[PDB]
Structure formats: structure tokens, C-alpha cells
Amino acid sequence: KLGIHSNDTRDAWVNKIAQLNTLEKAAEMLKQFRMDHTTPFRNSYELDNDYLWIEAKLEEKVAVLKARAFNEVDFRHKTAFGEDAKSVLDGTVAKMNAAKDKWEAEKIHIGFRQAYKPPIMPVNYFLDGERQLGTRLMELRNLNYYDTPLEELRKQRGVRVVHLQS
């Protein structure tokens, strides 16, 4: 079974997810998953064709568990890990505002997503963060966007140039 929308990989993860019966274990698995399989900093590209769908299934379980474990105030203001969402948001924005350059900035933003994307952090705080973090990231990145030659930009990004043609 190797399909696009249905396959053994997806089936396997649905089973593993079905075994996440407590919030803390489920939330930790979701965060680990994001570190292992999302963004260009992912630890591995092995689940490239299915991670988006599997992540969504993992999110579903963490959400249902959180709504059952958290009282109303905490569901609105705490992260699945028990952190005060406002504190995390403000602290991350502070780091972003102190970022010395676009390289530091991109790591702060990308890392924030991997660690706090809903249902970890309440949507209201998470998107407020997207609003503020993205603004600084773009400001830093779009300043003198074309000054660095491609030859040097490739080195800054740290890619391995495999083949060039022209």
C-alpha cells in the first residue's frame, strides 16, 4: 500500500497516535515530530510525502486531550505544556527584537513555530506572534536583498553546491 492519500506510513502513524492517551505524552510526541519532520531544519526528510497529514492527525489528538484536561481559563491562556502563553509570546518577541541579523531572526521565528504551533499554544497568542515575528523577520531579510552575490549567498545559507550549469 503506497498511495498518495492512503498508505502504510499513514496507517502506521494513525495506530501510534491512537495510543496517545494523556496530554503530556501526546503533546511531547507532537513537538518531537515537528522537530524531526517539519521546516528546512527538520532532522530528517524521510516522511516528506506524509508528514503534513500525520502532523494534522497528531494535532487532533493533542487538541482533544487538552480540552479534556484543561479548565476553561487554561485552555484559553496556557500552552499544552502548562506555560503561560502570554509570557512565552512576549519573551519570544523580545528575543526577535534583539536579533542582530536575519540569520538569528529566521531561527527564532522557525523555532517558535516548531515548538508552539497550535494546539500547543492557543491560536490567539500564536497568530499574534506570527504577526509580530514575521514583521521583524521580513524587515531584516528584505533590506538590501540583492547586494550579496549568489556565490556568497550560497555560502551564507551553507548549501553544498552539487551542480551548476549555464
Partner 1 sequence: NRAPTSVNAQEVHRWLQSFNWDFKNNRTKYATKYKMANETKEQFKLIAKEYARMEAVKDERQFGSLQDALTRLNAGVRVHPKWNETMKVVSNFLEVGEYNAIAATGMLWDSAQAAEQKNGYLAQVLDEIRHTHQCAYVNYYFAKNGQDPAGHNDARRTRTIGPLWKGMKRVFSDGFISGDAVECSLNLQLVGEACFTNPLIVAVTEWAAANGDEITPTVFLSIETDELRHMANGYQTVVSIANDPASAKYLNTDLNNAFWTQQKYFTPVLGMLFEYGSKFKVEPWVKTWDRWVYEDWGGIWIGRLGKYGVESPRSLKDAKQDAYWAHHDLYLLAYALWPTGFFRLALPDQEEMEWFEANYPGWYDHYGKIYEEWRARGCEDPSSGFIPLMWFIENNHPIYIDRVSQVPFCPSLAKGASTLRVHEYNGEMHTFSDQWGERMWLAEPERYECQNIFEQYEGRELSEVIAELHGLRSDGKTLIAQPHVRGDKLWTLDDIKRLNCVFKNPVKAFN
Partner 2 sequence: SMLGERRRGLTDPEMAAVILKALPEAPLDGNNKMGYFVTPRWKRLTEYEALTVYAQPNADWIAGGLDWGDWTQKFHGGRPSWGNETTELRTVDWFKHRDPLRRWHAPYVKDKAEEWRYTDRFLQGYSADGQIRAMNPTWRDEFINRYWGAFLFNEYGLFNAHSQGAREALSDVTRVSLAFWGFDKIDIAQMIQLERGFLAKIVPGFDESTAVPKAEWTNGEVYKSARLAVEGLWQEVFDWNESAFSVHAVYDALFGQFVRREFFQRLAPRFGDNLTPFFINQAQTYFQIAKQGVQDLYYNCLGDDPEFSDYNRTVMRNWTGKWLEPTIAALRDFMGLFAKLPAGTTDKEEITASLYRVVDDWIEDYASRIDFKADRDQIVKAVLAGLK
The binding site for partner 1 (CB under 8 A) comprises: 2-5, 39-42, 44-45, 48-49, 106, 110, 127-128, 130-135, 137-139, 141-143, 145-146, 150, 153-154, 156-166
Residue 18 contact partner, candidates partner 2, partner 1, none, CB within 5 to 8 A by sort of partner: none
**Residue 123 binding partner per list partner 2, partner 1, none, with a CB distance cut-off of 5 to 8 Å that depends on partner kind:** partner 2
CB of 76 to partner 2, least distance (A): 7
Question: Is residue 117 within the footprint of partner 2 (CB under 8 A)?
Answer: yes
Neighbours of 11 (CB within 10 A): 10
Q: How far is CA 1 from the centre of its chain?
A: 29
What 3 state SS string does 55-82 have? Answer: HHHHHHHHHHHHHHHCCHHHHHHECCCC
Compare residues 22 and 135 and give the one whose CB is closer to partner 1.
135
Q: Choose the one of partner 2, partner 1, none that binds residue 94, judging by a C-beta under 5 to 8 angstroms depending on kind.
A: none
Beta carbons of 56 and 34 less than 8 angstroms apart: no
Q: Between the CA of residue 149 and those of 98, 110, 144, 145, 164, what are the distances in Å?
A: 27, 25, 11, 10, 15
**104 alpha carbon, distance to own chain's centre:** 16
Which 3 state secondary structure label does DSSP give 84?
strand
166 binds, among partner 1, partner 2, none (CB under 5 to 8 A by kind): partner 1
Among 8, 60, 101, 152, binds partner 2 (CB under 8 A): 60
